[PDB]
Amino acid sequence: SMKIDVVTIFPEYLQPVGLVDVAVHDLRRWTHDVSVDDSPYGGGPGMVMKPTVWGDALDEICTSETLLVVPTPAGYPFTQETAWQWSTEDHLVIACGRYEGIDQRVADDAATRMRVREVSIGDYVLNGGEAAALVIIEAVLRLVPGVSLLEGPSYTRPPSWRGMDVPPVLLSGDHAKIAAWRAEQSRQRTIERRPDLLGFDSP
Amino acid sequence: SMKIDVVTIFPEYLQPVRQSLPGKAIDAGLVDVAVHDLRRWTHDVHKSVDDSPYGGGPGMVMKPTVWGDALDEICTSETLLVVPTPAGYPFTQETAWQWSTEDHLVIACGRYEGIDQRVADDAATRMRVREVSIGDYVLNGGEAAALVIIEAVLRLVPGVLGNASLLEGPSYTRPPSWRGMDVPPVLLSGDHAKIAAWRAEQSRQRTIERRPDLL
Ligand SMILES: N#Cc1ccccc1Cn1ccc2ccc(-c3cc(N)[nH]n3)cc21
Ligand SMILES: N#Cc1ccccc1Cn1ccc2ccc(-c3cc(N)[nH]n3)cc21
Numbered sequence: 001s002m003k004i005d006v007v008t009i010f011p012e013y014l015q016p017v018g019l020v021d022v023a024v025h026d027l028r029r030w031t032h033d034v035s036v037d038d039s040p041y042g043g044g045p046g047m048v049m050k051p052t053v054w055g056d057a058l059d060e061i062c063t064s065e066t067l068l069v070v071p072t073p074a075g076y077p078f079t080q081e082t083a084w085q086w087s088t089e090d091h092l093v094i095a096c097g098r099y100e101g102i103d104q105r106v107a108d109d110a111a112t113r114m115r116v117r118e119v120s121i122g123d124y125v126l127n128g129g130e131a132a133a134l135v136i137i138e139a140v141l142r143l144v145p146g147v148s149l150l151e152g153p154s155y156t157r158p159p160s161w162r163g164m165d166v167p168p169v170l171l172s173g174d175h176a177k178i179a180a181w182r183a184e185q186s187r188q189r190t191i192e193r194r195p196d197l198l199g200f201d202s203p
Numbered sequence: 204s205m206k207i208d209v210v211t212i213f214p215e216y217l218q219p220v221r222q223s224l225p226g227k228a229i230d231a232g233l234v235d236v237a238v239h240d241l242r243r244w245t246h247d248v249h250k251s252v253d254d255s256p257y258g259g260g261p262g263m264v265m266k267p268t269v270w271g272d273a274l275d276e277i278c279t280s281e282t283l284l285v286v287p288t289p290a291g292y293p294f295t296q297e298t299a300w301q302w303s304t305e306d307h308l309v310i311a312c313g314r315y316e317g318i319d320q321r322v323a324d325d326a327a328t329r330m331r332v333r334e335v336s337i338g339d340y341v342l343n344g345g346e347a348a349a350l351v352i353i354e355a356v357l358r359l360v361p362g363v364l365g366n367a368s369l370l371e372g373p374s375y376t377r378p379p380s381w382r383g384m385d386v387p388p389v390l391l392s393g394d395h396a397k398i399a400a401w402r403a404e405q406s407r408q409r410t411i412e413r414r415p416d417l418l
Pocket of ligand 2: 313315339341343344
């Protein structure tokens with residue numbers, strides 16, 4: 001059983017979402033004035049989300065058992081290992097930022113009462129945490145109980161299509177030769193596309 | 204001026220993209236994102252898009268015949284065909300910059316255990332094809348990857364999304380004190396050379412702790 005709460009100023013973006021419940025919360029519901037952001041101390045472009053509104057939202061939503069997940073380009077890497085680790089958690093809260101990010105004290109304050117993970121889902125920049133939340137939720141939930149090397153190419157019928165043949169070994173019924181061909185394809189694809197996974201220099 | 208076509212058996216998954224597009228960019232003809240149900244190109248009454256893998260194994264593989272027809276209709280020789288896959292080349296910020304000046308992206312979203320490899324291989328004989336991974340984790344299908352790619356690319360196209368190496372360090376804003384934590388005094392010092400040096404050291408420390416691979 002897992003509960004996931006997602007906090008965002010764009011709850012609509014999360015629409016693409018019994019052993020797991022997912023709830024989406026509008027951050028603005030915790031404002032009192034009739035502004036969630038302000039200019040950065042020390043200068044710089046763009047705006048930063050104020051800690052005040054976040055603190056009130058997280059106070060209500062989180063407990064000491066919560067794993068608070070904060071997407072950010074500056075985070076620790078979120079990998080399949082991370083997804084395995086989080087798949088056995090009772091409660092994930094995903095705090096989705098916008099603008100140029102969230103005041104650091106939100107995470108620092110939260111870490112005084114719960115576990116906090118600032119994470120990056122890849123080396124590119126999004127406009128906010130929502131797309132990262134969808135990625136994290138998908139990668140985690142498919143591993144929940146009750147639900148290295150790159151994969152090689154896959155094929156299905158027909159055996160010949162547009163004059164292109166399925167590799168004959170896959171039609172041979174020889175499990176050992178198929179196992180070996182697939183292993184070779186995987187290691188070949190890994191060296192070509194992700195040499196770092198095998199301990200070699202990146203392009 | 205960019206056209207993006209997304210092909211998927213879950214067209215509603217792409218709803219957040221069409222939502223996050225400012226009307227001004229659309230009416231200025233800067234961008235157009237269209238989403239297509241793959242089942243429109245199925246051949247049978249059961250609208251089949253998958254079939255068992257040659258060589259055996261778990262799960263299912265998406266049929267080449269259906270994808271071939273869809274891409275034939277949607278793509279041209281000028282198309283950059285983007286195919287998300289856990290086994291792809293890494294999609295990075297550099298990739299996003301490169302793709303941001305393309306006239307036509309087509310994103311082919313797979314499900315099940317992926318798409319028959321002949322689809323990409325056939326397409327590559329008449330257009331540019333890019334099999335890409337967005338990170339080292341496994342999704343259920345290509346749609347969340349398409350969302351990430353579209354957002355990372357379109358935020359680099361001037362005026363499209365409303366937005367205007369070492370890791371970035373921490374950021375702070377009002378109030379100067381909150382739950383017992385003060386904003387680092389240096390940021391309020393008005394010594395802008397010192398602030399830059401402080402920020403640089405924060406970046407260096409954070410990169411060491413979180414991403415030593417970058418050093
Ligand atoms: N933060 C930040 C930030 C900093 C500088 C420029 C733009 C942004 C946008 N942004 C605001 C919230 C937020 C959340 C997560 C991502 C994110 C994660 C990955 N892996 N890429 N992008 C980005 C986010
Ligand atoms: N392919 C495949 C596959 C292979 C084995 C197990 C599960 C899947 C699921 N799947 C089907 C389509 C598809 C597309 C993109 C991703 C994807 C990309 C990143 N960076 N992670 N996951 C996954 C996709």
